[PDB]
Scaffold this active site. Structure first.
Site, PDB file in Angstrom:
ATOM      1  N   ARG A   1      10.650   4.087 -11.990  1.00 48.64           N
ATOM      2  CA  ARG A   1      10.685   3.593 -13.351  1.00 48.64           C
ATOM      3  C   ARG A   1      11.774   2.528 -13.454  1.00 48.64           C
ATOM      4  NH1 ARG A   1      10.526   1.011 -18.158  1.00 48.64           N
ATOM      5  NH2 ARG A   1       9.315   2.111 -19.756  1.00 48.64           N
TER       6      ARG A   1
ATOM      7  N   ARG B   1       2.995  -4.689  17.365  1.00 45.13           N
ATOM      8  CA  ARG B   1       1.625  -4.321  17.087  1.00 45.13           C
ATOM      9  C   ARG B   1       0.682  -5.399  17.653  1.00 45.13           C
ATOM     10  NH1 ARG B   1       1.652  -3.305  10.847  1.00 45.13           N
ATOM     11  NH2 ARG B   1       2.839  -5.267  11.004  1.00 45.13           N
TER      12      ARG B   1
ATOM     13  N   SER C   1       0.845  -1.189   0.000  1.00 49.90           N
ATOM     14  CA  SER C   1       0.000   0.000   0.000  1.00 49.90           C
ATOM     15  C   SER C   1       0.888   1.249   0.000  1.00 49.90           C
ATOM     16  CB  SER C   1      -1.019   0.018   1.106  1.00 49.90           C
ATOM     17  OG  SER C   1      -0.439  -0.070   2.399  1.00 49.90           O
TER      18      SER C   1
ATOM     19  N   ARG D   1      -3.425   3.743   7.609  1.00 52.72           N
ATOM     20  CA  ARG D   1      -2.267   3.762   6.729  1.00 52.72           C
ATOM     21  C   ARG D   1      -2.149   5.064   5.937  1.00 52.72           C
ATOM     22  NH1 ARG D   1       0.922  -0.334   5.596  1.00 52.72           N
ATOM     23  NH2 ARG D   1       0.629  -0.556   7.830  1.00 52.72           N
TER      24      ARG D   1
ATOM     25  N   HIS E   1       5.475 -13.270   8.762  1.00 54.04           N
ATOM     26  CA  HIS E   1       5.526 -11.959   8.113  1.00 54.04           C
ATOM     27  C   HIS E   1       6.577 -11.967   7.000  1.00 54.04           C
ATOM     28  CE1 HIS E   1       4.589  -7.504   8.472  1.00 54.04           C
ATOM     29  NE2 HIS E   1       5.501  -7.523   7.521  1.00 54.04           N
TER      30      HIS E   1
ATOM     31  N   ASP F   1      -2.096  -8.861  12.773  1.00 54.83           N
ATOM     32  CA  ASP F   1      -3.410  -9.268  12.289  1.00 54.83           C
ATOM     33  C   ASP F   1      -4.036 -10.388  13.136  1.00 54.83           C
ATOM     34  OD1 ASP F   1      -3.757  -7.319  10.122  1.00 54.83           O
ATOM     35  OD2 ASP F   1      -2.500  -8.661   8.824  1.00 54.83           O
TER      36      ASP F   1
ATOM     37  N   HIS G   1      -2.441  -8.577   1.358  1.00 58.96           N
ATOM     38  CA  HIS G   1      -1.973  -7.433   2.116  1.00 58.96           C
ATOM     39  C   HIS G   1      -2.927  -7.054   3.244  1.00 58.96           C
ATOM     40  CE1 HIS G   1       0.001  -3.790   3.224  1.00 58.96           C
ATOM     41  NE2 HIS G   1      -0.450  -2.990   2.279  1.00 58.96           N
TER      42      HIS G   1
HETATM   43  C1  LIG Z   1       2.871 -13.486   6.295  1.00 62.51           C
HETATM   44  C2  LIG Z   1       3.350 -14.640   5.415  1.00 62.51           C
HETATM   45  C3  LIG Z   1       2.648 -14.549   4.057  1.00 62.51           C
HETATM   46  C4  LIG Z   1       4.855 -14.540   5.196  1.00 62.51           C
HETATM   47  O1  LIG Z   1       5.265 -15.694   4.412  1.00 62.51           O
HETATM   48  P1  LIG Z   1       6.369 -15.509   3.267  1.00 62.51           P
HETATM   49  O2  LIG Z   1       7.344 -14.473   3.715  1.00 62.51           O
HETATM   50  O3  LIG Z   1       5.663 -15.330   1.966  1.00 62.51           O
HETATM   51  O4  LIG Z   1       7.090 -16.937   3.264  1.00 62.51           O
HETATM   52  P2  LIG Z   1       7.884 -17.791   4.360  1.00 62.51           P
HETATM   53  O5  LIG Z   1       9.284 -17.293   4.478  1.00 62.51           O
HETATM   54  O6  LIG Z   1       7.063 -17.868   5.599  1.00 62.51           O
HETATM   55  O7  LIG Z   1       7.881 -19.209   3.622  1.00 62.51           O
HETATM   56  C5  LIG Z   1       8.317 -20.370   4.360  1.00 62.51           C
HETATM   57  C6  LIG Z   1       7.166 -21.331   4.518  1.00 62.51           C
HETATM   58  O8  LIG Z   1       6.492 -21.065   5.774  1.00 62.51           O
HETATM   59  C7  LIG Z   1       5.104 -21.132   5.567  1.00 62.51           C
HETATM   60  N1  LIG Z   1       4.459 -20.383   6.633  1.00 62.51           N
HETATM   61  C8  LIG Z   1       4.734 -19.111   7.050  1.00 62.51           C
HETATM   62  N2  LIG Z   1       3.982 -18.731   8.054  1.00 62.51           N
HETATM   63  C9  LIG Z   1       3.172 -19.827   8.318  1.00 62.51           C
HETATM   64  C10 LIG Z   1       2.161 -20.059   9.270  1.00 62.51           C
HETATM   65  N3  LIG Z   1       1.772 -19.159  10.167  1.00 62.51           N
HETATM   66  N4  LIG Z   1       1.554 -21.269   9.248  1.00 62.51           N
HETATM   67  C11 LIG Z   1       1.950 -22.168   8.337  1.00 62.51           C
HETATM   68  N5  LIG Z   1       2.885 -22.060   7.398  1.00 62.51           N
HETATM   69  C12 LIG Z   1       3.464 -20.851   7.446  1.00 62.51           C
HETATM   70  C13 LIG Z   1       4.918 -20.585   4.159  1.00 62.51           C
HETATM   71  O9  LIG Z   1       3.668 -20.948   3.622  1.00 62.51           O
HETATM   72  C14 LIG Z   1       6.080 -21.274   3.446  1.00 62.51           C
HETATM   73  O10 LIG Z   1       5.669 -22.592   3.114  1.00 62.51           O
HETATM   74  P3  LIG Z   1       6.309 -23.157   1.749  1.00 62.51           P
HETATM   75  O11 LIG Z   1       7.810 -23.231   1.923  1.00 62.51           O
HETATM   76  O12 LIG Z   1       5.693 -24.528   1.585  1.00 62.51           O
HETATM   77  O13 LIG Z   1       5.905 -22.215   0.637  1.00 62.51           O
HETATM   78  C15 LIG Z   1       3.032 -15.971   6.105  1.00 62.51           C
HETATM   79  O14 LIG Z   1       3.565 -15.901   7.417  1.00 62.51           O
HETATM   80  C16 LIG Z   1       1.552 -16.309   6.171  1.00 62.51           C
HETATM   81  O15 LIG Z   1       1.013 -16.875   5.223  1.00 62.51           O
HETATM   82  N6  LIG Z   1       0.903 -15.995   7.285  1.00 62.51           N
HETATM   83  C17 LIG Z   1      -0.547 -15.874   7.349  1.00 62.51           C
HETATM   84  C18 LIG Z   1      -1.052 -14.631   6.655  1.00 62.51           C
HETATM   85  C19 LIG Z   1      -0.796 -13.390   7.482  1.00 62.51           C
HETATM   86  O16 LIG Z   1      -0.810 -13.439   8.708  1.00 62.51           O
HETATM   87  N7  LIG Z   1      -0.556 -12.252   6.821  1.00 62.51           N
HETATM   88  C20 LIG Z   1      -0.392 -10.965   7.480  1.00 62.51           C
HETATM   89  C21 LIG Z   1       0.899 -10.283   7.107  1.00 62.51           C
HETATM   90  S1  LIG Z   1       0.797  -9.402   5.527  1.00 62.51           S
HETATM   91  O1  LIG Z   2       7.295   3.983 -21.142  1.00 65.54           O
HETATM   92  C1  LIG Z   2       7.102   5.022 -20.517  1.00 65.54           C
HETATM   93  O2  LIG Z   2       7.556   5.235 -19.359  1.00 65.54           O
HETATM   94  C2  LIG Z   2       6.271   6.101 -21.215  1.00 65.54           C
HETATM   95  C3  LIG Z   2       4.809   5.731 -21.371  1.00 65.54           C
HETATM   96  O3  LIG Z   2       4.041   6.490 -20.801  1.00 65.54           O
HETATM   97  C4  LIG Z   2       4.323   4.528 -21.837  1.00 65.54           C
HETATM   98  O4  LIG Z   2       4.275   4.309 -23.042  1.00 65.54           O
HETATM   99  O5  LIG Z   2       3.716   3.749 -21.095  1.00 65.54           O
HETATM  100  O1  LIG Z   3       4.528  -4.892   6.063  1.00 65.14           O
HETATM  101  C1  LIG Z   3       3.826  -5.677   5.431  1.00 65.14           C
HETATM  102  O2  LIG Z   3       4.118  -6.102   4.280  1.00 65.14           O
HETATM  103  C2  LIG Z   3       2.540  -6.152   6.110  1.00 65.14           C
HETATM  104  C3  LIG Z   3       1.490  -5.066   6.244  1.00 65.14           C
HETATM  105  O3  LIG Z   3       0.447  -5.308   5.659  1.00 65.14           O
HETATM  106  C4  LIG Z   3       1.705  -3.785   6.708  1.00 65.14           C
HETATM  107  O4  LIG Z   3       1.760  -3.568   7.913  1.00 65.14           O
HETATM  108  O5  LIG Z   3       1.611  -2.807   5.960  1.00 65.14           O
END
Ligand SMILES: CC(C)(COP(=O)(O)OP(=O)(O)OC[C@H]1O[C@@H](n2cnc3c(N)ncnc32)[C@H](O)[C@@H]1OP(=O)(O)O)[C@@H](O)C(=O)NCCC(=O)NCCS
Ligand SMILES: O=C([O-])CC(=O)C(=O)O
Ligand SMILES: O=C([O-])CC(=O)C(=O)O
Ligand SMILES: CC(C)(COP(=O)(O)OP(=O)(O)OC[C@H]1O[C@@H](n2cnc3c(N)ncnc32)[C@H](O)[C@@H]1OP(=O)(O)O)[C@@H](O)C(=O)NCCC(=O)NCCS
Lengths: 434, 434
Positions: free
Chosen positions: B419, B327, B242, B399, B318, B373, B272
């Site tokens: 870019r 948090r 975001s 945010r 995360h 979360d 997200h």
């Molecule tokens: C937040 C999150 C996406 C980060 O994962 P990531 O950085 O993409 O990946 P990771 O480094 O954790 O990947 C390692 C493995 O751990 C797994 N994992 C991570 N957190 C996990 C959890 N709480 N439970 C189970 N598995 C989990 C991933 O799915 C991944 O499995 P894979 O190797 O089979 O693909 C992950 O912790 C998650 O899915 N949590 C639940 C969603 C959530 O809470 N999101 C809020 C934050 S934006």
């Molecule tokens: O490529 C660029 O950055 C210029 C443009 O706006 C595009 O064609 O999408």
């Molecule tokens: O930091 C991240 O990617 C997770 C999140 O959604 C945030 O707090 O903005």
């Protein structure tokens, strides 16, 4: 056959495997370095993302899945009674990597025509918007409000398999592309045609034609321009703001509707989507200042003034390209045959002779040739599309083509959340000291 | 004094000079490398952008201009009769790098209260939206439609000096933050309170309080939760979708309205903004499956099932953080004092004991602790905010604080169009072979 979704079902596994292989071998291959200036300088020069549909050689300009504008002009199917390439065919190219057949194109025309209906709530919304709300604002809000129609968003929340993502994305992308002209034309009519209706989709007309009909034009050659216009604006790598925005937002699994609308807000930015307008404004001011008809040497001296006074001769130069934009030439050709005696064009034609000759001497430049935006303005004005505020709506309707084509592939290939690392100046300083 | 704009006028030149210096010395300092996997892997690990307002140490969690959540809890001004930090104060911190004074905060409360009025066309728009249009869709479209009120967009097109950009951006950002609760609450009431009005801004109430009033709540502690909520969701580096979206779109000189709305479409993405909801859903399913009251060892065995069946225990882990989210703790503390006997909380409380113990053993994890979360959901539900679809609206209202604070600085510091360079797989392959 003609069912794109089926051909896409065929292609995806092959690409997935090719990619997985490459990542196993060369995943740790360093392909460039990150400097402090790249962090401060808006990632300039940094290879940051994979985007498959188009690649810009800073030398010869943009290629769609391997093919240049000139090739596209010859290979791509044309309207029945046309000489300009249907953007349908271009969509097909970006999606499949293959030049389509007339039958494929015709099938896509019919598909988009079938899907084009707007929900009432979006018509209400557009119909209630005031006339001072920018066209692009109207467009972006409308597309956001379309997300009520999203397959992907509904299915995602039910717990569909990742493997099926691309399928939902394709359906939504197809729906969105179909509805965009309707949205775009409802905006045009609400703003400039006193809220008259857009009327009916012809199921047997191409997308560009159904568009210009809904916009309330009838001239053959405006419909041919539109066909060219939509084709050549369709895609320009993934680094440009609208493309990248679409890619970034999509990476969070936001549906094509939300992804596109986000992209449109970036396209709305002066530094991305407005150069068309700025050219046309600058030209009008040029004619006001030293006259509408001019000798070459007079024209030449005016140029220097703009520069030395701290102003950019607009429509010339580009963030990455380094030669006359195929998208300009394209338009020039269209104007050497359809309005060579239009005066605004003659002026456009004249600046192509003088601006390049200078500019380089100014030093500050890199790119001394015209971009697409130098030329589109006078063509649109010539057919009576004089509403400059609206011109980015056109651009966006076009750019949906490339960024949805990519969005499908991004989901098909399982690209993850885009999530680069940031640093504060302070942190970046404490990093380098270490 | 109390006029933030004046303090900002003071700070900007100092930072500009500090930056210019650093770029002269260390502009070519390589701060990392780009691999093929980083290009395919959504830029993971790649330092890509400068974002000044907050920095996430993957160890101790997020810091706002140098200060942790715990410090913020103590230093930041509180409501008169409050123990939770006003998000006004947090905005002040992100903008200035300085903890504000009660007077500064009070001044900001009054400013936001003065600016909070919605234009009719946005009320019409919200009032005509159907109940099946997602809250976040409503929010994003509404904010886009606000861009009619933009100072920056109007002044830009008149040819204002770059030096003045930040000033316009500040005014718009201030206007937008002020209007957001109004927008957000109009959505809430249209959807869940049969279209009743939001009523009046109290000029002598803080932002969070005027919000919860417009949302139609009155409980003191819900208003204190909201204050905490808005504070701690406010910012999380610039790499999150975001933040980055806002930054990317702003880089094209799209106004804060368009920049924020783009950001909201990215926040809308399942990956997200939706984890809050997914936790609360998962918990409800947990209680349905093995019961609402449970022993620790029972609870323990259920966990393994989720995992081995190919499912993520949500709210844990995360993308970058690597320990119990400040948090989360923040919220826990709020629930060890205000609802320790709420059962959903007890369960939240219990999983904090068992989930970490396992998860690591699953291997796949990196981050075995809870994120924000995991905890927000039961707190919101407890005070009667049971409408899960709406919960990301809250997150976005929060945010805005961080991403507008940054957007001001990005314009103040003259950051250019973002870019990066893209490559097709094919091009990337022909690159590495060379
Ligand atoms: C937040 C999150 C996406 C980060 O994962 P990531 O950085 O993409 O990946 P990771 O480094 O954790 O990947 C390692 C493995 O751990 C797994 N994992 C991570 N957190 C996990 C959890 N709480 N439970 C189970 N598995 C989990 C991933 O799915 C991944 O499995 P894979 O190797 O089979 O693909 C992950 O912790 C998650 O899915 N949590 C639940 C969603 C959530 O809470 N999101 C809020 C934050 S934006
Ligand atoms: O490529 C660029 O950055 C210029 C443009 O706006 C595009 O064609 O999408
Ligand atoms: O930091 C991240 O990617 C997770 C999140 O959604 C945030 O707090 O903005
Ligand atoms: C497109 C454009 C922004 C690319 O510039 P860039 O990649 O950011 O920067 P450059 O490498 O050109 O910068 C070198 C210098 O040339 C200048 N320059 C570039 N094109 C110029 C032109 N047509 N006339 C005058 N000066 C120009 C830049 O302002 C810069 O000056 P500076 O060193 O004092 O800052 C630039 O060509 C421009 O401003 N053109 C007009 C706007 C336009 O046509 N945009 C459409 C494409 S998105």
């Amino acid at each position: 056959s003609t069912n794109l979704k089926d051909i896409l079902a065929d292609l995806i596994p092959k690409e997935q495997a090719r990619i997985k292989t490459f990542r196993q071998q060369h995943g740790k291959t360093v392909v460039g370095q990150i400097t402090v200036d790249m962090m401060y300088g808006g990632m300039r020069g940094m290879k940051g993302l994979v985007y498959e549909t188009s690649v810009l050689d800073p030398d010869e300009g943009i290629r769609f899945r391997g093919f240049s504008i000139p090739e596209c002009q010859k290979l791509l199917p044309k309207a029945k009674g046309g000489e300009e390439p249907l953007p349908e065919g271009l969509f097909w190219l970006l999606v499949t990597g293959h030049i389509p057949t007339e039958e494929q194109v015709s099938w896509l025309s019919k598909e988009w025509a079938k899907r084009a209906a707007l929900p009432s709530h979006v018509v209400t919304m557009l119909d209630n918007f005031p006339t001072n709300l920018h066209p692009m604002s109207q467009l972006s809000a409308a597309v956001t409000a379309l997300n009520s129609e999203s397959n992907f968003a509904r299915a995602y929340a039910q717990g569909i398999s990742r493997t099926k993502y691309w399928e939902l994305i394709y359906e939504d992308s197809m729906d969105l592309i179909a509805k965009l002209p309707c949205v775009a034309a409802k905006i045009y009519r609400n703003l400039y045609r006193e809220g008259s209706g857009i009327g009916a989709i012809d199921s047997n007309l191409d997308w560009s034609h159904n568009f210009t009909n809904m916009l309330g034009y009838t001239d053959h050659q405006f419909t041919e321009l539109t066909r060219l216009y939509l084709t050549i604006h369709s895609d320009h790598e993934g680094g440009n703001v609208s493309a990248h925005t679409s890619h970034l937002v999509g990476s969070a699994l936001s549906d094509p509707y939300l992804s596109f609308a986000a992209a449109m807000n970036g396209l709305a930015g002066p530094l991305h989507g407005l150069a068309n307008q700025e050219v046309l404004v600058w030209l009008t001011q040029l004619q006001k200042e030293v006259g509408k008809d001019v000798s070459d040497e007079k024209l030449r001296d005016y140029i220097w003034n703009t520069l030395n006074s701290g102003r950019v001769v607009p429509g010339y130069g580009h963030a990455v390209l380094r030669k006359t934009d195929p998208r300009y030439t394209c338009q020039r050709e269209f104007a050497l045959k359809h309005l060579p005696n239009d005066p605004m064009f003659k002026l456009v034609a004249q600046l192509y002779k003088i601006v390049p000759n200078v500019l380089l001497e100014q030093g500050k430049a890199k790119n001394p040739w015209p971009n697409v935006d130098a030329h589109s303005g006078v063509l649109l004005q010539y057919y009576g599309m004089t509403e400059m505020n609206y011109y980015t709506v056109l651009f966006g309707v076009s750019r949906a083509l490339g960024v949805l084509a990519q969005l499908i592939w991004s989901r098909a290939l399982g690209f993850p959340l885009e999530r680069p690392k940031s640093m504060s100046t302070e942190g970046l300083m404490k990093f380098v000291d270490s």
